[PDB]
């Protein structure tokens, strides 16, 4: 879902200044903006 | 087999003084605690006891105890097992070091593995350790088998 | 299964081999745990082998345990593995529990 | 036991990984950010001081240096004890060492953000970076530690057997398997009844 959502795991360097990193209880799965962070969290939690 | 046994015995009963009016009264209710416990008399145990009747003798009293005795004839079901033959019992209890049977839904069984031929082998099973199956030398399965035939040596036997 | 498994055979020592050689090593493990109801004091007793309810145990004044099995597994560095199990004591149980 | 090992060591052993690959993890953005720049070089050449390169080289010094206090299996071979190593103790959580690689690059990442101010001290005396161990949890972890004092006990047992001359050694006979298990403690039990 975090994929279809918006974020990537990279394998080069997919990283830059204002992104920000989302960890699966320890297991770094993607990067994106912290606008996009806060809605995917809104919406994670909404699906839930 | 044929290990049921009815003996008509004839005994001393000591007829309390207050059923001085009538000893039946007293016999039975002595009689009620012969039942079930064993005879050993005979070696056997009570199961059933009918035809009370006295030798008319009007009863003798003790010299110095009020309560009087009296020969009376009786009927016993005695069950003799004295390991005649081949009976059989439901298994109850079964675990590798005996097997535990009821012969008439009453009597117990230890038969255990030494009396019993080596081949036959016993499993433990996950639920229960020792509640599993002593499986025999064939292979046949004996609890829903829960009726066995053996020979009594006393006391069981499956050594043959 | 995390925990894996042991090796066991015999050294040679290797005093300049390099390749200390050794043939007959076995590697063993468990292959499971299993934890059973805590029956009567199981070792037959001439009497119907039932269960033991923990008000049982607190009224004799005794812990409340139930045998433990090992599923212990074999290799002779070879593909043997055959099974077998293994009690390795009692350990308790908690009320109500599983 | 504490031990120590370079973070730069252990990170060029857990990945076939070239030290620009390293460099453009852990500060690849806004590229040249003076603090983690000038740091992180000065890492990689703190470890470039003594260390080798490839990550295998890396694998049979740490194996021959740690085979000691691993109880690992004394015969196979050095290169398998790095990897036991990497496998064993540096990320435990995690399998894929690429995985657990790209974590230690975003873990000392932010551990220089932390050293710069860039980022506020978590508070381990807080409910916040805090949960709760059960009954059941720590039970099982006691009893799997028993199990595995116990297999290393059988493991002894069987060594001594082969060490005194040669009293049984068949690893064939399940005879001898039946007394080596004898020969063993075969209660525990009581060791979880007594620490309860």
């Not at chain 2, 110095?64 to 019992?89: A, H, N, Q, T, Y």
């Not at chain 4, 080798?52 to 049979?60: A, D, G, H, V």
Request: glycine share 8%; with cysteine.
């Amino acid at each position: 879902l975090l994929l279809s959502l918006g974020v990537d795991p990279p394998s080069v360097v997919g990283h830059e200044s204002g992104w920000g990193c989302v960890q699966l209880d320890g297991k770094i799965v993607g990067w994106c903006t912290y606008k996009l962070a806060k809605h995917v969290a809104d919406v994670l939690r909404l699906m839930k | 087999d044929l290990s049921l046994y009815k003996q008509t015995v004839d005994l001393y009963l000591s007829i309390a003084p207050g059923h001085s009016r009538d000893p039946l009264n007293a016999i039975q209710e002595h009689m009620d605690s012969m039942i079930l416990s064993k005879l050993p008399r005979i070696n056997g145990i009570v199961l059933a006891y009918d035809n009370i009747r006295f030798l008319e003798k009007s009863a003798k009293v003790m010299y110095d105890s009020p309560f009087s005795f009296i020969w009376v004839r009786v009927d016993v079901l005695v069950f003799s097992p004295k390991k005649g033959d081949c009976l059989e019992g439901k298994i109850n209890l079964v675990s590798p070091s005996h097997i535990g049977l009821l012969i008439l839904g009453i009597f117990n069984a230890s038969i255990p593995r030494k009396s019993i031929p080596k081949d036959w082998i016993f499993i433990e099973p996950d639920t229960t350790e020792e509640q599993g199956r002593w499986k025999t030398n064939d292979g046949n399965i004996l609890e829903p088998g829960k009726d066995l035939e053996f020979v009594v040596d006393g006391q069981g036997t499956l050594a043959n | 299964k995390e925990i894996g498994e042991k090796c066991a055979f015999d050294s040679i020592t290797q005093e300049e081999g390099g390749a200390l050689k050794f043939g007959n090593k076995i590697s063993f493990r468990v292959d499971e745990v299993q934890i059973a109801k805590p029956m009567l004091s199981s070792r037959e007793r001439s009497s119907i082998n039932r269960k033991v309810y923990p008000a049982e145990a607190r009224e004799r004044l005794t812990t409340y345990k139930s045998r433990l099995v090992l599923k212990f597994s074999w290799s002779v560095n070879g593909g043997p593995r055959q099974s077998e199990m293994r009690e390795v004591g009692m350990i308790p149980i908690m009320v109500r529990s599983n | 036991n504490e031990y120590l090992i370079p973070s730069m060591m252990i990170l060029k052993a857990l990945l076939e990984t070239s030290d620009k690959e390293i460099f453009e993890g852990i500060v690849g953005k806004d590229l040249g950010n003076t603090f983690l720049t000038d740091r992180v070089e000065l890492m990689l050449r703190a470890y470039k001081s003594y260390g080798l390169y490839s990550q295998t080289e890396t694998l049979q010094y740490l194996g021959s240096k740690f085979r000691v206090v691993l109880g690992v299996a004394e015969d196979l071979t050095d290169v398998e004890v790095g990897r036991f190593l990497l496998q064993k103790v540096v990320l435990v959580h995690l399998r894929e060492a690429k995985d657990k690689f790209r974590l230690l690059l975003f873990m000392i990442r932010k551990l220089y953000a932390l050293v710069a101010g860039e980022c506020c001290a978590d508070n381990p005396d807080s409910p916040q970076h805090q949960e709760i161990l059960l009954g059941g949890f720590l039970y099982g972890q006691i009893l799997k530690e028993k199990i595995e004092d116990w297999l290393n006990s059988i493991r002894a047992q069987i060594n001594l057997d082969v060490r005194r001359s040669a009293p049984g050694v068949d690893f064939s006979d399940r005879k001898y398997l039946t007394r080596v298990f004898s020969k063993i403690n075969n209660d525990i039990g009581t060791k979880l009844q007594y620490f309860l």
